[PDB]
Design a protein around this ligand. Sequence first.
Ligand SMILES: NC(=O)c1ccc[n+]([C@@H]2O[C@H](COP(=O)([O-])OP(=O)(O)OC[C@H]3O[C@@H](n4cnc5c(N)ncnc54)[C@H](O)[C@@H]3O)[C@@H](O)[C@H]2O)c1
Lengths: 42, 49
Amino acid sequence: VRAVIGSTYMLTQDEVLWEKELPPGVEELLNKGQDPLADRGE
Amino acid sequence: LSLSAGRPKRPHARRALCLLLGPDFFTDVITIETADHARLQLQLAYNWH
Ligand SMILES: NC(=O)c1ccc[n+]([C@@H]2O[C@H](COP(=O)([O-])OP(=O)(O)OC[C@H]3O[C@@H](n4cnc5c(N)ncnc54)[C@H](O)[C@@H]3O)[C@@H](O)[C@H]2O)c1
């Protein structure tokens, strides 16, 4: 598994999509808290 | 910018987007106490730029 970033990509032969799961509570930090200089109050 | 506002100047009371850097003023209410233990409150005004 790797990360392909940048230009548009078609998956070749023998390539599939991988799912990156995260430890619990980290997703809550990613979606809710956008700008910690902005909404750092709470 | 998350700024402070209000009459006793609470924090997180005025979110803004641009920074005004002109000769404005803001006013605060300060409760102090003297060497005779006289509790008394003030109203001040702060010319800044
Ligand atoms: N030269 C002057 O005397 C002068 C000039 C302009 C405005 N004023 C006015 O005097 C009033 C004083 O009232 P107050 O301070 O008790 O009310 P307040 O305590 O609610 O005001 C908060 C202060 O934050 C400042 N401020 C708000 N948004 C800002 C931003 N995006 N960038 C930079 N600064 C920002 C304002 O100038 C204001 O003085 C202000 O409301 C202001 O409009 C005075």
